[PDB]
RNA sequence: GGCGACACACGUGCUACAAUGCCCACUACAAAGCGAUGCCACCCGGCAACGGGGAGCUAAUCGCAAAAAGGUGGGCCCAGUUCGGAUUGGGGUCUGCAACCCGACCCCAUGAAGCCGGAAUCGCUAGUAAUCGCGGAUCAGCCAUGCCGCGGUGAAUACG
RNA sequence: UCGCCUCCUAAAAGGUAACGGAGGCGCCCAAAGGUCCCCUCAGGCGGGACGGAAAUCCGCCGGAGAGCGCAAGGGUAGAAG
């Protein structure tokens, strides 16, 4: 889901981080 | 979207506040949407510039985060052949 | 004579309240809710009887009384159908059964309606009668949802011995008719 | 189980079954069953009636959902009825609200193509 | 009359918030989620929210920053 | 104010229609480059964007970065569905004098079209095509899915 | 055009002509037939989900303007419907 802003995969693709992709640990 | 600023034009407010003591006349222009709806002087008209002319917009509560020029469309469109 | 809570609620509460509100001098001048008749406009069964029968037993379950088919009076090529053709069900119920239905109507079904802000107060006849539309029929406690095929509704007519549509406005208000102010 | 305005989802995980309500989505889903204290991976098939009651009582209250909040959302757009702003006119003309590109695309609000030709 | 209609048994039915009687109908007892004569939704009124107004909050949210004040 | 207009038409693309797939958690393995009018370790508030602190670094020393596809475990079970993410409501953050016209993110809720594409049409012969992430220029910010580079895994076929 | 049916011409009995004014027929129905028992229409105004000028439903008002297989006339709800 490279364009969904609610996945670790979409957050990768977008670049930014957040709740669905924390800044590690 | 500001939070700790939440600004209005100083010059818009200067003209708006010194013409707010005990009443006024609706003759008041501007040149900047940049501002914000401003509570008080609700029963007022602010002639906003749309790039071409000054459109008299009217305030009647209801409006807030919408500054001015949203009440002043700059384009016309109107139709596409139809 | 059975019993029925709404029936009692009419006599030992709603009844004397009317004699106070309106000051009727006779025991019969008081508005008496009688005859509630359910009708289903069934164009859906324009050309189907197994869709009409399913609507029959469905209705028989919520009123405890078999409905009767109505037939088209004339013929309208503008929207099919000829003289015959079972187009519409209808069951009349007065006494006992009318109350048992009216209870589950007000005290189960009506609140089970999506959103629902209350019955229309302008939906009054002018001769002391009331009518109300219904969409889904699954709002009745005897309907089990997972046994339906189509969401067909019904019109409901509640007849009353009142004169004006005020004395009825009052009579039903007391019985528990939510009127959206 | 007729939770809010709906009942549909049977044998399909309560954290997922919840999603099938306008107002729940995915975040409020697990948030509701951790706050109600119910196992998310359950059958949804009418399990313990008590869990279902607590769930219903919490969910249906708390926040607005289903037909009620659809009405509120539609009313928030009705806000820009009156003598409203620019954003209202975009809801009027049927065009994209967020000032995007309308020269091409914008089909999700404009609808399928009409083709003028000339 | 005889030999067609369903019969009408005594009273018992379960509400999602409490109790209900009457029943009759055909089934002995049935379940009802959204209760009625009890209390929720237009039965004593339980104002779930209030739908915020901009004259109040947004004049005190944008106005929370009273830097533009006076 | 406009270059951002929108009844429409074409090009180059990005994201998909799913199960050799999606989600969550854990755990590995790169290169090439950029930074002390900046990169910002580690703590603290915060669901998060981010804010408070604050160490090291004129940088094969410190930081940007954990590479991602992979592997392990678990969950969905083929249905517009935990596929897909458009559109829209609400709430926020950051740069900026200021983001209505027109900024990027974050969070809640919506969840559209699409179930693999007519006539046509394109690329590639070995590290190649396909797929996966990383860096830089411009740059306050950014509409970058673009362009210029970096490496990861790694086909098929060529009679003629 | 040529037989049959209806209305007018037709001069308040019947009858009455013209290459006068207008229309129908050459069938249909085993129920649209017999009888017994029930029932009352069209419209107008309100009320009512989908449902509109007309679909079914409730309510008043409505002596017959409906209906009576098909032309027209006569008749007809105290029925022929
Ligand atoms: Mg635009
Ligand atoms: Mg340009
Ligand atoms: Mg589709
Ligand atoms: Mg499929
Ligand atoms: Mg070659
Ligand atoms: Mg004569
Ligand atoms: Mg005569
Ligand atoms: Mg004579
Ligand atoms: Mg007979």
- Say if C and E touch: at least 3 Cβ pairs within 8 Å: yes
- Contact residues on chain E for B34, CB-CB shorter than 8 A: none
Cα distance between residue B70 and residue B57, in whole Å:
10
Q: How many structural domains does chain C have?
A: 1
Cα C49 to Cα B15: distance, rounded to the nearest angstrom = 77
Task: Please list every residue in chain B whose beta carbon sits closer than 8 Å to the beta carbon of residue E57.
Answer: none
D8 and D51 share one domain: yes
DSSP for residue B40: S
CATH code (residue C30): 3.30.1440.10
Distance B53 CA to ligand 6 centre (A): 92
E2 annotated binding-site participant: no
Bases of chain G below 7 A from a protein C-beta are: 42, 46-60
Distance in angstroms (rounded) separating the CA atoms of residues C43 and C59 = 16
Measured distance CA(C59)–CA(C174) in Å, rounded: 27
Q: Which residues of B23-32 are buried (b: 16+ CB within 10 A; e: fewer)?
A: eeeeebebee
Which domain, by its residues, includes D115?
A: 72-118
Answer whether E59's CB lies under 8 Å from B39's CB. Answer: yes
D16 and D65 both lie in a single domain: yes
Is the Cβ of E69 closer than 8 Å to some Cβ of chain B? no
Per the CB < 8 A criterion, the answer to whether D85 and B68 are in contact is no
Mutate to test the interface with E, among B4, B6, B65 (most CBs of E within 10 A): B6
* Token pair listed for D65: 């959902």
Q: Which residues in B lie closer than 8 A to residue E70 (C-beta atoms)?
A: 17
**Resolution of the experimentally solved model in angstroms:** 3.1
C144 lies within 8 A of chain D by CB: no
Q: Do D75 and E33 touch (CB under 8 A)?
A: no
How many residue contacts between B and D have a Cβ separation below 8 Å? 20
Chain D residue at shortest CA distance from C117? D68
The technique is X-ray
CA distance, residue D103 to nearest chain E CA (Å): 34
> How many whole angstroms separate alpha carbon B71 and alpha carbon B46?
10
Task: Enumerate helices (H) and strands (E) in chain A, giving the number of each.
Answer: 1, 0
Q: Which residue of chain E has the CA closest to D59?
A: E48
Q: Which residues of B touch D103 (CB under 8 A)?
A: none
Task: Say if residue D14 is in the same domain as residue D24.
Answer: yes
Interhelix angle for D49-60 vs D27-35, to 10°?
Answer: 120
Q: Is E14 helix (H, G, I), strand (E, B) or coil?
A: strand
D81 and D66 co-located in one domain? no
- For D38-82, give the DSSP string: --TTS--SS--HHHHHHHHHHHHTTS--THHHHHHHHHHHGGGST
Q: How far apart are CA C22 and CA A13, in angstroms?
A: 75
Calculate the CA C36 to chain-centre distance: 5
Q: Which two tokens mark D81? A: 């009825």
**Positions of strand F less than 7 angstroms from a protein CB:** 1-11, 14-16, 22-26, 47-50, 65-66, 68-69, 75-77, 81-113, 133-134, 145
What is the tally of structural domains in chain D? 2
Taking the C1' atom of every nucleotide in all shown strands and the CA of D96, the nearest one is F87
- Tell me the nt nearest to B2, Cα to C1': F93
- Phi, psi values for residue C53, rounded to 5°: -65, -40
Rounded to whole angstroms, the distance from the CA of residue D107 to the C1' of nucleotide F69 is: 34
N residues, chain A: 25
Q: What is the dihedral of CA D89, D93, D94, D99, to 10 degrees?
A: -50
Statement to judge: residues D108 and D51 lie in one domain: no
- Residue C88: phi and psi, rounded to 5, are 120, 135
Task: Residue D8: give its domain's CATH number.
Answer: 1.10.8.50
Domains of chain B: which residue ranges? Answer: 6-82
Q: How far is the CA of D113 from the centre of ligand 3 (A)?
A: 16
CA–CA separation, C100 vs C81, rounded Å?
36
Shared-domain flag, residues D105 and D62: no
- Domain hosting residue C130, numbered range: 2-181
- As its CATH architecture, domain B6-82 has 2-Layer Sandwich (3.30)
Sign, Cα dihedral of D64, D65, D67, D71: positive
Contact D80, D87 (CB under 8 A): yes
Measuring from the CA of residue C137 to each C1', which nucleotide is nearest? G49
Q: Which of C7, C93, C107, C139 to substitute to test the interface with E, most E CBs within 10 Å?
A: C107
**What is the DSSP secondary structure assignment for residue C124, as one 8-state letter?**
B
């Amino acid at each position: 889901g490279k364009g969904d802003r609610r996945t670790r995969r979409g957050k990768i693709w977008r670049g930014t981080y957040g709740k669905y992709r924390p800044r590690k640990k | 979207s500001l939070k700790k600023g939440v600004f209005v034009d100083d010059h818009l407010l200067e003209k708006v506040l010194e013409l707010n003591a005990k009443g006024e006349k609706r003759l008041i222009k501007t040149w900047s949407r940049r501002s914000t709806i401003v509570p008080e002087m609700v029963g007022h008209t602010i002639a906003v510039y749309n790039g071409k002319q000054h459109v008299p917009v009217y305030i009647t509560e209801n409006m807030v985060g919408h500054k001015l020029g949203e009440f002043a469309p700059t384009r016309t469109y109107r139709g596409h052949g139809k | 004579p059975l019993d029925v809570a709404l029936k009692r609620k009419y006599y030992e509460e709603v009844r004397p309240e009317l004699i106070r509100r309106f000051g009727y001098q006779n025991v019969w001048e008081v508005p008496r809710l009688e005859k509630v008749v359910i009708n289903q406009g069934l164009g859906e069964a324009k050309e189907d009887a197994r869709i009409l029968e399913k609507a029959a037993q469905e209705l028989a379950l919520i009123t405890g009384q078999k409905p009767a088919v109505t037939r088209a009076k004339k013929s309208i090529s503008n929207f099919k159908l000829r003289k015959g053709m079972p187009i519409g069900l209808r069951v009349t119920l007065r006494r006992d059964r009318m109350w048992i239905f009216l209870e589950k109507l007000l005290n189960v079904a009506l609140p089970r309606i999506r959103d629902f802000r209350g019955l229309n107060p302008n939906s009054f006849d002018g001769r002391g009668n009331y009518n109300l539309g219904l969409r889904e029929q699954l709002i009745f406690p005897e309907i089990t949802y997972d046994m339906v095929d189509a969401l067909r509704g019904m019109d409901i007519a509640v007849v009353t011995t009142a004169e004006t549509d005020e004395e009825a406005r009052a009579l039903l208000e007391l019985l528990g008719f939510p009127f959206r102010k | 189980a007729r939770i809010a305005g709906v009942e549909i989802p049977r044998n399909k995980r309560v954290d997922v079954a919840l999603t099938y309500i306008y107002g729940i989505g995915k975040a409020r889903a697990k948030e509701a069953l951790e706050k109600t204290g119910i196992n998310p991976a359950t059958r949804v098939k009418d399990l313990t009636e008590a869990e279902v009651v607590r769930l219903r009582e919490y969910v249906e209250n708390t926040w607005k959902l289903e037909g009620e909040l659809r009405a509120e959302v539609a009313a928030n757009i009705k806000r820009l009825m009156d003598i409203g702003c620019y954003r209202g006119l975009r809801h009027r003309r049927g065009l994209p609200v967020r000032g995007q590109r309308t020269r091409t695309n914008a089909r999700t609000r404009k609808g399928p193509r009409k083709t003028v030709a000339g | 009359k005889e030999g067609i209609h369903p019969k009408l048994v005594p009273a018992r039915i379960i509400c999602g918030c409490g109790n209900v009687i009457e029943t009759y109908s055909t089934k002995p007892e049935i379940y009802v989620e959204v209760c009625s004569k009890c209390h929720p939704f237009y039965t004593g009124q339980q104002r779930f929210v209030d739908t915020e107004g901009r004259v109040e909050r947004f004049q005190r949210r944008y106005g929370d920053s009273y830097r533009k004040g006076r």
